[PDB]
Design a protein around this ligand. Structure first.
Ligand SMILES: CCCCCCSC[C@H](NC(=O)CC[C@H]([NH3+])C(=O)O)C(=O)NCC(=O)O
Length: 221
């Protein structure tokens, strides 16, 4: 039939996205843990170009990059469970637009906030991350259509893209003292966070914040 194996390291948000996607469709797969200081031959041969996770392996064939994997699953397993992407080409473009926004205007500056070298750098990342969240709120306002997700009535691509970093966001709040989806500024997003984490898929896939936090504090130190 179809064997699926996910190569990942549990703290990675990029892995978390793929786990959400698999869980959303109810797809069974083997979850394989990779040590990034001692990568397996299967990892090194499946993603020789970046040697990064996640990597989904389907019947022995690798697919890399979290958002690409998500669409690969959407297309191959269309007849199984809900789709992350809409049917309509316009709607699909818009969703891809916001995924890109998330990656470039949110996740990247957030990374800089966290692993920035100079304090100014940490501070600019932070600043940018916050401005991005205010823009994402307007996107949710326009995409919910009363269902509450970036995908409308069901979880979509954008929801997963963002959803994958939610454990890290909570960890960030604990380290910094700052609330990323502060309800007073971004009430729609604060409520979206609560709706998302309550999904069964999210419960199965998002990493534990306590462990995540210990892991983070050791890397910061
Ligand atoms: C586990 C700590 C979490 C830190 C965030 C980095 S996630 C791990 C990192 N992978 C990500 O960079 C992949 C990004 C890729 N754009 C995706 O979307 O799938 C990796 O495998 N890096 C390989 C390596 O570090 O050797």
């Amino acid at each position: 039939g179809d064997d699926l194996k996910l190569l990942g390291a549990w703290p990675s948000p990029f892995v978390t996205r793929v786990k959400l996607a698999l869980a959303l469709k109810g797809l069974s797969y083997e979850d394989v843990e990779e040590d990034l200081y001692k990568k397996s031959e299967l990892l090194l041969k499946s993603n020789p170009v970046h040697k990064k996770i996640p990597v989904l392996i389907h019947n022995g064939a690798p697919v890399c990059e979290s958002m690409i994997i998500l669409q690969y699953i959407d297309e191959v397993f269309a007849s199984t469970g809900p789709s992350l992407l809409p049917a309509d080409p316009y709607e699909r473009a818009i969703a891809r637009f916001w995924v890109a926004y998330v990656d470039d205007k949110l996740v990247a500056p957030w990374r800089q906030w966290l692993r920035g070298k100079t304090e100014e750098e940490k501070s600019e990342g932070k600043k940018q991350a916050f401005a991005a969240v205010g823009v994402l709120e307007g996107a949710l306002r326009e995409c919910s259509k009363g269902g509450g997700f970036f995908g409308g009535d069901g979880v979509g691509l954008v929801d997963v893209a963002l959803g994958g970093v939610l454990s890290w966001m909570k960890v960030t709040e604990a380290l910094s003292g700052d609330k990323i989806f502060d309800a007073a500024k971004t009430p729609l997003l604060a409520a979206w966070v609560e709706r998302f984490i309550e999904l069964d898929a999210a419960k199965a896939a998002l990493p534990d914040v306590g462990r995540l936090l210990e892991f983070a504090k050791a890397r910061e130190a």
